[PDB]
Amino acid sequence: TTIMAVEFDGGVVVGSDSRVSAGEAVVNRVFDKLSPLHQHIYCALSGSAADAQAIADMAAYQLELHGMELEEPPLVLAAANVVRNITYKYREDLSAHLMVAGWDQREGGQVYGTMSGMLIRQPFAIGGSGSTYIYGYVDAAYKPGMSPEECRRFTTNAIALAMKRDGSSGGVIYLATITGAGVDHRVILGDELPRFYDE
Amino acid sequence: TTIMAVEFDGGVVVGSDSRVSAGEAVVNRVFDKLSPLHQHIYCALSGSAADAQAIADMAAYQLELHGMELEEPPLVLAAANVVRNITYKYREDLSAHLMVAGWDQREGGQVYGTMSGMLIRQPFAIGGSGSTYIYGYVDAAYKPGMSPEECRRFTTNAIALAMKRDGSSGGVIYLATITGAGVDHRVILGDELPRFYDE
Amino acid sequence: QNPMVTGTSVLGLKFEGGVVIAADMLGSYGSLARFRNISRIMRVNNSTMLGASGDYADFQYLKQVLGQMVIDEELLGDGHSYSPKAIHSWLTRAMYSRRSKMNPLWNTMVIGGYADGESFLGYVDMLGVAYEAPSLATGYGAYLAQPLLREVLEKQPVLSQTEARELVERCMRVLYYRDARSYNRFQIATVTEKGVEIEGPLSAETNWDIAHMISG
Amino acid sequence: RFSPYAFNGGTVLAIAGEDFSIVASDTRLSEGFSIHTRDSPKCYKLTDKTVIGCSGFHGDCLTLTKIIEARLKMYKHSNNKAMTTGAIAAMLSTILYSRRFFPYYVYNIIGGLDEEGKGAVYSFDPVGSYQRDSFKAGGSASAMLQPLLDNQVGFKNMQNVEHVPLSLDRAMRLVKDVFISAAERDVYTGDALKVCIVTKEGIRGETVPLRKD
Amino acid sequence: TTTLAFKFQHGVIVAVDSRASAGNYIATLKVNKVIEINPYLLGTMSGCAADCLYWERLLAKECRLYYLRNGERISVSAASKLLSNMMCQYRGMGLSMGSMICGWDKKGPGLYYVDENGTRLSGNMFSTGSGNSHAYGVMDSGYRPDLSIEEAYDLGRRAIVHATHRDSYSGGVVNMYHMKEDGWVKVESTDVSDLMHQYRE
Amino acid sequence: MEYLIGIQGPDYVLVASDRVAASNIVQMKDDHDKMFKMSEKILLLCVGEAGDTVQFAEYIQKNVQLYKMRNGYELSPTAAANFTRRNLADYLRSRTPYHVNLLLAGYDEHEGPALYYMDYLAALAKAPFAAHGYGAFLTLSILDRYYTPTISREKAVELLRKCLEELQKRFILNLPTFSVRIIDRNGIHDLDNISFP
Amino acid sequence: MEYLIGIQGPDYVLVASDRVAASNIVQMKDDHDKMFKMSEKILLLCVGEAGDTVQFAEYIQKNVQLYKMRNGYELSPTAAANFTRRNLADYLRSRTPYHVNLLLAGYDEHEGPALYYMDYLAALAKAPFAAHGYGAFLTLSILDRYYTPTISREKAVELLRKCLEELQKRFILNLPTFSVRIIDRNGIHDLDNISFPK
Amino acid sequence: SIMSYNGGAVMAMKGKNCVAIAADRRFGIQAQMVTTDFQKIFPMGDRLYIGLAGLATDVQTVAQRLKFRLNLYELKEGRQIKPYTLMSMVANLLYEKRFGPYYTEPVIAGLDPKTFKPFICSLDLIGCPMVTDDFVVSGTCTEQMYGMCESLWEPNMDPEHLFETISQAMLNAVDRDAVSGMGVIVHIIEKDKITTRTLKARMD
Amino acid sequence: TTIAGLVFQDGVILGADTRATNDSVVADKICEKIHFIAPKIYCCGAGVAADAEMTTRMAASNMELHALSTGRECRVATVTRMLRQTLFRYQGYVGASLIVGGVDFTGPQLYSVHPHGSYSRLPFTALGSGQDAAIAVLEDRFQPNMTLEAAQELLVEAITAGILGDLGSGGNVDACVITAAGAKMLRALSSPTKPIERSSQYRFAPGTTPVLSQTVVPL
Amino acid sequence: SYDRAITVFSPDGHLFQVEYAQEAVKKGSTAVGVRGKDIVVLGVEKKSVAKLQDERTVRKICALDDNVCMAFAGLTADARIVINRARVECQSHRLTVEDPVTVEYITRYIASLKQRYTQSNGR
């Protein structure tokens, strides 16, 4: 369970891992944890897979009903608030944790950590049990003002480093990049994963 | 509790954190965790600080006699079996886990993780609660056969970022570098801690 | 309920015609120090302010409720403002109902305020303990900075902004040493007759020379 | 996890003289072995003749204080009269039982003048029982103050000694010295002493210092 | 804490002590356990002190309600009957109350025992409380169905004396209440300690 | 643990209840009658947790009294236990589960005298004789030896003394005083209370 | 629970006990003898766990007989108590602590009759009367009423039955069969075992 | 808990040239008492006495062990033991059992076997030596016994004020403790004599 | 219980208070804490009271053995090694906590002994319940190699924290100063509690106690 | 649901709805009753059926309890609801109080229902 988000000038980059693990026996090793909140707005699931999927559709609904009323995509801040208001409400019976990121025609690329039901604005956010060991790598490698390709470098390498140590994180990477033009998708295969020091 | 040991040809770099915490409170903000077992043999204390110090004297005791019989300082691997055989017997009573390092006229620099009464050799070894967060960090910047001063900086960089990320660790950096002509001792002030990403 | 974003010590002290409040910018998840940039202090109208400890998540929810309540009086234009008392009174009563419902918001909050030359400072607890003291601390700061404050308050009960903030600079300097969950970044919020003035992030110069004195 | 209440210490003792009632308690408020503040008055005046201290968990004291005053002034405007010292007793007793399944942890001692002008003391308990007595105590030091109460006021365990009705001068000597003795040996009492005395004219309140530790 | 009462041809005598303690520490020596309901109805106290106060005062309201309703001066059996109902509502919620019901009606000086679960028991001779076991022995040695009112008090005094003597939780001073047709009367409030020298020698 | 016992003859139903109500080491009321009357020809005997006996018995008792007023006739013994079982089963899973073990006796112009056994889980059974409590061990085994379908009601009580005396001899708890009643087409007939002077 | 009682008179000590031993819901044997003869002028009773009574009694009983052989004269009641206590307190810290409630009776050549009280906590208390078990709740209040240090032995037997029959009138256990033995200047004598003609 | 299980209490106060020691006579298990004949104060010899409280199990057990080790030291030296020497004897007898602790709270009082000097002390389950020039209190009523002794104590007291003070304490103290009771025995060591007086106390 | 110490240029200082309690009430106000081991060596206890008592005695008993046999000065760190080796045999089950300081031939050595056997070398530390407040003063205002006079005045204000800041500490403060010249002891250096007075006195004449029975045994 | 006032006042103050209710009372069959010395006796006339009806359902003299009985004259419709719910009160009173029912106690609870039905919404 590893999710990642990085902010830059024109937009944000959101990575994810495909391993869905419960216990020591993998349940489903191939899955796409990216759940669209909207065409221009996405979220990153974490924690319990089943409980997180329900909040995604309950958020993608309330956001869609508000979207067509003004005929404009809601602000990224409005997306994090809906995720927070739903999370914090049921947070006692739901252990799911989410990561909200998106782009708008005003503010631009934004990332808001919803973890545990709080709200925070960060240039980069990590979550899950696999991200616990990447706190060291994210500090030295990250520098502001990186291009989307340079961001995907820092994004993929940090996730390719994550899934090695964590037992509950693995599989392939699903990337999403939202800019003024549109949405991009990149899938990094196990052999396509950048390989690090294994000794 | 954050301890770090890195091997290279000319010697070993053994780092440690000065902060020792009892529960949520700090025992002593500056406490030296490096206790020599033998002349050139040193030990990295972790787990329970008390039990680790009692093992240090029982080790050093047995090393005295056995060191006087050969008229030669016992090899690093010899002290590894000493600490382990005492740890494996008391493993239920003694919960402390030690990281053994040292240098000898034959094998050279050797670091042996004794955690849970086992025996292994590694290019670099780390232990404690705060050593977890630096896994991916060191893995990106680690290269075989780095220069000793940069190895001293590599351990200085790692632990420094661990103390900021770990709430249970902190204080000042210790540096133990063993050579053929002696042993180096370094204490880095809190003002001289390597500065990493602040935000 | 869960280990969610636990906070740190919260320090405050009265002075002449104002209140000094200081808190670290570090959020802490479990034993890990995770979020090193967060906003602990909120400005409430001109004369009042709030800062908290414990769960930062549950705070933002109650932090948001205050904002909507302040809007109610601002829309009226009645010519009045919320006093630090009433806010401290509403907060104690609002957090109280959380205990009777067995779902308490887990926090420790401090309210600074300035009313007609009399600066009010107050303290609340999750369980509802509330009082007024010239020096207030939270967590292990109550075991460290609190006796240091009361040592100076005996000789200098009346203080200005000069020595107050300068003493607070020395208060959090100890919080590095004996408080493991503290962090370098901190905020200094001062409430005066001109309203709340919140300075940006600051650091502290410390002396570690005790390390080199061990080998002696 | 979560504890519904924690023992905060504190001590409240109220003695009712012939025509007067004296109520004195410290200002020391603590949590476990940790001290909050040295000024935390327990005694809370309600009406002219009614002042009540509450010894126990301090947060539950404020909620009762507000609910009481909420019923007090509601009684006033509706009933066009103030509540007597004896009337507040049975009122708060019914207030405590409504919460019986979530018991308030406090020791409530009512004091003031009755309809006849005599000093009245009503001691409560967290479950809501009530009784009237000449002298009551509360808190942690309440156990240590009883022999001195059974001596000066009680006159028990002496051989042919005249029983004098207690006086204000003796009370100021008694009530202070028993606290001076209690604050020494008991850790939860000290740092100050406040005294609330109510006569037919009104309240008379003064503060006398105790040992700082 | 000891509460005992017993029914006999001349009415009922209620004998309790004054000491109600919290743990090993004595709360107050002078605590009055016996509670007033009506001129002809007298209540008791056992276990939780507040549960006896509230419910018997609520029953005192119920005793007034029906009396303000049908003015029939409700019977003693119906009293404990109404008390049993209201207690069975919260049964299982943690209410622990021992108590007794004393009164006089057309049937006679009715005596009833009420438990926490709503158990309603009439009878000639009762007892309850912590140290009640010490009361049964001394009270059951000899019996006269028709009691002489004086020696009847002595049988009630000597009971409480040796009862509170063995029990650490029973003590304080003696409380004694006789029952009569029109209304009950309080016999005496007497120290337990000074009653020993009589029986001791 | 109070003790109930009952025996159904061809023309009669013999029931016996211990009169002792005790708490801890003392007997509260030793003569207290546990036998309750549902209707003229139908009684009920209950044993279990103290408050559950008294309280729950009034439910079945008062509600059957309401039936006779509407239709002009009493319930049958079969309808009795039925109405008793469902009400006890509906309240079994409720917030306040009742602990009671009851024997239901009654007479009918066709089914004759009837005896129905019921546990604390409201499991109905039709047996010639049954008992409750720990005393059922020391007693019902004796009845298995000496019982016959043709037994007269006179030898019934004569036989019951053999089972009751074992309670004073081997069985630990006192239970000095016993109540005895019998029901037939002529209605309830009370009998002597067996005591051991 | 089984019940013990004893009374010390000026020239005598009278002891009485229930002979019924029970397990589960039934009473197995009503003739079980609690009263044990330690020596000529000394006699012992006990109550406790079913197996520890007879087990621990013979040890204290026969060890006194070994002393009587060496010096030729039997122990005094006072010496038997402190020798019983210290031996009973030693078994507490072992793996099998004995549950014991006992009454020690004997006739000294000087002090005359003596009665001693001990419990499973091994606490020796010299008292003219004592009780054990659940009956100590329903009985000892009767003794303080009718007892005097000058009481005659025949008044004791009378008042004894008044204390004993209380168990069937109130206490839940039957315990019909009782036993009676007494010690005096002439040593151990026996009296008719108290029964209850129901 | 276990300390308050079997009850008991003891008090000792030191005067000018004399010292007094007192303890309650009540003995019994929890709610039900037994008898007043349990003795909590035992003679240690001339001008030396010891009180005991807590669980009466080890009270009488430690006692017989005290005189045991004492009778050895009595004959081995030509002169009798001092109270300050006995204090460590009781502390060491309790400490060897530290891992299976005895339950008691010993209190020692007496005079210097040389001439006039009084001495008192108090201990606990751990047996920490504590020397006070005023008084020592031990028992389940200890909290109540600090109240009177703080007020009543005087810098210098004759045998008169000695007997008066400590007696008023115990009589007032026990009143609030339901566990302690049933009379108090008072011992006073004078220069040329020693007295024992049984107090008339509340019966409860 | 609050105990603390510091090292100055010419030696060491060990502060302590006199308060002893049983976690509800004060057992003794004047009860001593600092003990005597060797002529130049002192120590103080914390945690469980008596567990420090016998531990220091058995440690000091081995000193006079060691001392008289060697005829040499007593080594500071030797006393520290005795304790923890004795405490580790109990696996930290003993709640005793100690501070060891003194003067040897080399120089001032101040240690601290934790219950589980952990030990540390350091200029200053505090133990007990009120250790927190007492540490705060020693952290900020400490200076390297302080003068004895400034070191004593720092100890005064030091324990003021643990006294005024914690309930489990109080009474008076007995200063302990050790130099190379010999041993020195002080008692009640500071009196933080002024109200030692009382407004009422109870003194009863002989005959006010209703005594029942009496007996007199002359010596 | 159906919520409105049914019975309302008039310019002369009298109740239209209630007077028409007592009119239907007089339109019913004639029933009588008296309070005897040691007994009570009730009676009601029977409209003469011709060789058809069964007298079980036609009987207008009922019994609420062993202590108290009743008779009714008016619309047979509303009579059976009162008889049923009054017998419920008779058993509920014995369920609440061990003492038997009182004629005055049961009577007031009966007429109190008709007062509720008058002032209740939609009734």
DSSP string computed for B94-127: -----EEEE--TTT-SEEEE-GGG---B-SEEEE
Instruction: List the structure tokens of C175.
Output: 């919080």
Contacts of E146 (CB under 8 A, 6+ apart): E8, E9, E10
Element (H, E) at I185: strand I182-185
**Cβ atoms of residues G100 and G117 within 8 Å:** no
Q: Which residues of H touch E164 (CB under 8 A)?
A: 204
Torsion of CA B82, B84, B90, B91, to 10 degrees: 170
Cβ-defined contact of G166 to E137 (cutoff 8 Å): yes
**Cβ atoms of residues E14 and E5 within 8 Å:** yes
* Residue environment code for C181-197, b if the CB has 16+ CB neighbours within 10 A, otherwise e: bbbbbbbbbbbbeeebe
Element (H, E) at F81: helix F77-90
Q: Determine how many CB atoms are found less than 10 A away from the CB of residue C118.
A: 10
**Structure resolution, Å:** 4.1
Residues I176 and I5: their CA atoms lie apart, in Å, by 9
* Residue environment code for H160-193, b if the CB has 16+ CB neighbours within 10 A, otherwise e: ebbbbbbbbbbbbbbbbbbbbbbbbbbbbbbeee
Instruction: List the structure tokens of A91.
Output: 């947070």
Q: Which of I150, I132, I154 is nearest to I5 (CA)?
A: I154
Cβ-defined contact of C57 to A117 (cutoff 8 Å): yes
- To test the contact with chain J by mutation, choose from E72, E73, E83, E106 the residue with the greatest count of J C-beta atoms within 10 A, namely E72
Residues F169 and G174: their CA atoms lie apart, in Å, by 8
Instruction: List the structure tokens of H26.
Output: 């009540």
- To test the contact with chain A by mutation, choose from C35, C62, C63 the residue with the greatest count of A C-beta atoms within 10 A, namely C35
Instruction: List the structure tokens of H1.
Output: 């808990």
DSSP secondary-structure letter at F169? H
Instruction: List the structure tokens of E31.
Output: 């605590």
Long-range CB pairs of F149-152, under 8 A, 24+ apart, other chains included: F149/F10, F150/F10, F151/F9, F152/F9
Burial of G145 per CB tally in 10 Å (0-12, 13-18, 19+): middle
As a whole number of angstroms, the longest Cα–Cα distance in chain H is: 48
Element (H, E) at I138: helix I131-140
Hey, which chains touch D, using 3+ CB pairs under 8 Å? C, E, H, I
Residues E103 and E56: their CA atoms lie apart, in Å, by 14
- Which residues on neighbouring strands pair with residue H34, listed in sequence order? none
Instruction: List the structure tokens of A185.
Output: 């998708």
Residues B51 and E188: their CA atoms lie apart, in Å, by 70
Under 8 Å CB pairs connecting chains G and H tally to 40
Torsion of CA G33, G34, G36, G41, to 10 degrees: -110
Backbone angles phi, psi at A60, to 5 degrees: -65, -25
Q: Which of E141, E78, E111 is nearest to E12 (CA)?
A: E111
DSSP secondary-structure letter at I190? B
Backbone angles phi, psi at C21, to 5 degrees: -125, 135
Using H for helix, E for strand and C for coil, what is the string for chain A?
A: CCEEEEECCCCEEEEEECCEECCCCEEECCCCCEEECCCCEEEEEECCHHHHHHHHHHHHHHHHHHHHHHCCCCCHHHHHHHHHHHHHHHCCCCCCEEEEEECCCCCCCEEEECHHHCCEECCEEEECCCHHHCHHHHHHHCCCCCCHHHHHHHHHHHHHHHHHHCCCCCCCEEEEEECCCCEEEEEECCCCCCCCCCC
Domain interval for residue C91 = 1-215
- Cα J53–Cα J58–Cα J59 angle in degrees, nearest 5: 135
Q: Determine how many CB atoms are found less than 10 A away from the CB of residue D103.
A: 17
Residue A194, CA distances (Å) to A155, B132, F172, H64, J90 in order: 11, 22, 82, 82, 87
Cβ-defined contact of A88 to C61 (cutoff 8 Å): yes
**Cβ atoms of residues D110 and D116 within 8 Å:** no
Q: Which of H11, H14, H39, H4 is nearest to H155 (CA)?
A: H14
Residue E129, chain H, CB below 8 Å: the answer is: no
Cβ-defined contact of C181 to B191 (cutoff 8 Å): no
Q: In this complex, does chain I touch chain J, defined as having at least 3 beta-carbon pairs under 8 Å apart?
A: no
I178, amino acid identity: I
Residues C33 and A142: their CA atoms lie apart, in Å, by 19
Q: How far is CA F194 from the centre of its chain?
A: 16
Residue C214, chain I, CB below 8 Å: the answer is: yes
Number of H helices and E strands in chain E, helices first, is: 5, 13
Sign of CA dihedral J22, J28, J34, J35: negative
Residue J102, chain E, CB below 8 Å: the answer is: yes
Torsion of CA E60, E62, E64, E68, to 10 degrees: 180
Percentage helix, strand, coil for chain E under 3-state DSSP, each rounded to 5: 35, 30, 35
Min distance J22 CA to chain E CA atoms (Å): 29
Element (H, E) at I26: strand I26-28
**Cβ atoms of residues A93 and A47 within 8 Å:** no
Residue G161, chain E, CB below 8 Å: the answer is: no
Q: How many structural domains comprise chain C? A: 1
Contacts of I95 (CB under 8 A, 6+ apart): I47, I48, I51, I115
Backbone angles phi, psi at J11, to 5 degrees: -60, -25
Contacts of C58 (CB under 8 A, 6+ apart): C4, C105, C106, C107
Instruction: List the structure tokens of J111.
Output: 């007429």
- Which residues on neighbouring strands pair with residue A127, listed in sequence order? A3
Residue E193, chain H, CB below 8 Å: the answer is: yes
Q: How many Å is the Cα radius of gyration of chain C? A: 18
List the single residue in F with minimal CA-CA distance to E136: F26
Contacts of H167 (CB under 8 A, 6+ apart): H22, H184, H186, H199, I209, I211
Burial of I166 per CB tally in 10 Å (0-12, 13-18, 19+): buried
Backbone angles phi, psi at A20, to 5 degrees: -105, 110
Instruction: List the structure tokens of H60.
Output: 């009488």
List the single residue in H with minimal CA-CA distance to I50: H128
J43: left (phi over 0), alpha (psi -120 to 50) or beta: beta
D17, amino acid identity: G
Q: How far is CA A83 from the centre of its chain?
A: 13
List the single residue in B with minimal CA-CA distance to C201: B199
Sign of CA dihedral E16, E19, E21, E24: negative
What is the Cβ-side half-sphere exposure of residue D124, based on CA atoms within 13 angstroms? Answer: 30
Cβ-defined contact of G166 to E135 (cutoff 8 Å): no
Burial of D50 per CB tally in 10 Å (0-12, 13-18, 19+): buried
Residue J50, helix vs strand vs coil: coil
Cβ-defined contact of G89 to H61 (cutoff 8 Å): yes
Q: Which residues of E touch J96 (CB under 8 A)?
A: 81-82, 85
Element (H, E) at D206: strand D203-208
Which experimental method was this entry solved with?
Answer: cryo-EM
Cβ-defined contact of G26 to F172 (cutoff 8 Å): yes
Can you point out the beta strands (E) in chain G?
4-8, 13-18, 21-23, 26-29, 36-37, 42-48, 100-107, 113-118, 125-126, 129-131, 178-184, 187-191
Q: Which of I129, I168, I199 sits opposite D173 (nearest CB)?
A: I199
- Which residues on neighbouring strands pair with residue I213, listed in sequence order? H198
Q: Which residues of A touch C37 (CB under 8 A)?
A: 122
Number of H helices and E strands in chain J, helices first, is: 4, 4
* Residues counted in chain H: 204
- Which residues on neighbouring strands pair with residue D110, listed in sequence order? D52, D122
Contacts of I171 (CB under 8 A, 6+ apart): D213, I17, I18, I19, I26, I29, I30, I163, I193
Hey, which chains touch H, using 3+ CB pairs under 8 Å? D, E, G, I
Q: Which of G130, G195, G127 is nearest to G161 (CA)?
A: G195
Q: Which of E110, E109, E61 is nearest to E83 (CA)?
A: E61
Instruction: List the structure tokens of E85.
Output: 């109902």
Residue C210, chain B, CB below 8 Å: the answer is: yes
Q: Which of I167, I177, I185 is nearest to I19 (CA)?
A: I167
DSSP secondary-structure letter at G47? E
Residues E143 and E156: their CA atoms lie apart, in Å, by 12
Q: Which residues of J touch F62 (CB under 8 A)?
A: 91-92, 94-95
Cβ-defined contact of E168 to H31 (cutoff 8 Å): yes
Residue A119, chain C, CB below 8 Å: the answer is: yes
Instruction: List the structure tokens of C61.
Output: 């929810």
Using H for helix, E for strand and C for coil, what is the string for J111-123?
A: HHHHHHHHHCCCC
Contacts of F186 (CB under 8 A, 6+ apart): none
End-to-end CA distance of chain G: 22
* Residue environment code for C136-166, b if the CB has 16+ CB neighbours within 10 A, otherwise e: bbbbbbbbbbbbbbbbbbeeeeebeeeebbe
Residue E196, helix vs strand vs coil: helix
**Cβ atoms of residues E1 and E130 within 8 Å:** yes
Domain ranges of chain G: 1-197
Residues A125 and A118: their CA atoms lie apart, in Å, by 13
* Residue environment code for E2-27, b if the CB has 16+ CB neighbours within 10 A, otherwise e: bbbbbbbebbbbbbbbbbbbeebbbb
Min distance H169 CA to chain D CA atoms (Å): 8
Residues of E labelled as active-site residues = 1
Residues C182 and B167: their CA atoms lie apart, in Å, by 8
Instruction: List the structure tokens of J70.
Output: 């009743």
- Which residues on neighbouring strands pair with residue F118, listed in sequence order? F102, F124
Q: Which of H15, H55, H21 is nearest to H41 (CA)?
A: H21
> Which residues 126-185 of E have a C-beta within 8 angstroms of D?
none
Q: Which of H122, H195, H157 is nearest to H17 (CA)?
A: H157
Contacts of G191 (CB under 8 A, 6+ apart): G157, G180, G181, G182
* Residues counted in chain D: 213
Residues of I labelled as active-site residues = 1
DSSP secondary-structure letter at D181? H
List the single residue in J with minimal CA-CA distance to E120: J98
Min distance H153 CA to chain E CA atoms (Å): 25
Domain ranges of chain D: 1-213
Hey, which chains touch C, using 3+ CB pairs under 8 Å? A, B, D, I
* Residues counted in chain C: 216
Q: Which of H144, H172, H175 sits opposite D144 (nearest CB)?
A: H144
Instruction: List the structure tokens of A27.
Output: 């349940």
Residues F108 and F113: their CA atoms lie apart, in Å, by 6
- What is the spatial order of strands in the sheet that F13-18 belongs to? F129-131, F4-8, F13-18, F178-184, F187-190
What is the Cβ-side half-sphere exposure of residue G66, based on CA atoms within 13 angstroms? Answer: 6
Instruction: List the structure tokens of H70.
Output: 């004492």
**Cβ atoms of residues G6 and G129 within 8 Å:** yes
> Which residues 36-65 of H have a C-beta within 8 angstroms of G?
37-38, 55-57, 59-61, 64
Using H for helix, E for strand and C for coil, what is the string for A153-164?
A: HHHHHHHHHHHH
Residues J120 and J116: their CA atoms lie apart, in Å, by 6
Cβ-defined contact of D144 to H172 (cutoff 8 Å): no
Burial of D209 per CB tally in 10 Å (0-12, 13-18, 19+): exposed
